[PDB]
Amino acid sequence: FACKTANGTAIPIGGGSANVYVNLAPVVNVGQNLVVDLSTQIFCHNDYPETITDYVTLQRGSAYGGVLSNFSGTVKYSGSSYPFPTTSETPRVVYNSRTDKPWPVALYLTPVSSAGGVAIKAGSLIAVLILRQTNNYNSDDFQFVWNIYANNDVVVPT
Numbered sequence: 001f002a003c004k005t006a007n008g009t010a011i012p013i014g015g016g017s018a019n020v021y022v023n024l025a026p027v028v029n030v031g032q033n034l035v036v037d038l039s040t041q042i043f044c045h046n047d048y049p050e051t052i053t054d055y056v057t058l059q060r061g062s063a064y065g066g067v068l069s070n071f072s073g074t075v076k077y078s079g080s081s082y083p084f085p086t087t088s089e090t091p092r093v094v095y096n097s098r099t100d101k102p103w104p105v106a107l108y109l110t111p112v113s114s115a116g117g118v119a120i121k122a123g124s125l126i127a128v129l130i131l132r133q134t135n136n137y138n139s140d141d142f143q144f145v146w147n148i149y150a151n152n153d154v155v156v157p158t
């Protein structure tokens, strides 16, 4: 089991960390969502699907910077929704193929009332999503840590 990003880097077998940049709508109002869909960017695969089944959860989601300070959030993981920042590890998703399959995670972020002006700075860390991977074969239990960075400023119209 390993993962890689759409158009950049990889986390190899055994886990590790990687930095991911996301495009964000440049203007969002109170009551509207920024949708950050990571399933078009993070892809994982099972390296031995014939003998091993891999299990993948969103172990934890954390907010940082302007997201932590200026937005309220939910996370969608494989068809279900949760508070973001998360309050516990999610059910698991099965990886059973050598073909790349998306990691099905998306954030829905909505500005809080106190947000106004540049609520998220270009280049700043906005979230960390931890992918935890185990299997039905041995005691492997690995973390794939995705630091999510804002590509651009996001403005909440005052």
Ligand SMILES: COC(=O)CCCCCCCCO[C@H]1O[C@H](CO)[C@@H](O)[C@H](O)[C@@H]1O
Pocket (backbone or CB within 6 Å): 001, 002, 013, 014, 045, 046, 047, 048, 049, 051, 052, 053, 054, 134, 135, 137, 140
């Ligand atoms: C009875 O013999 C076997 O079951 C050997 C099966 C082929 C060798 C498998 C060696 C271990 C491969 O491990 C990697 O690939 C596995 C499958 O993706 C992951 O579950 C592991 O965590 C790790 O990422």
Ligand code: NI
Pocket (backbone or CB within 6 Å): 001, 002, 045, 046, 047
């Ligand atoms: Ni591989």
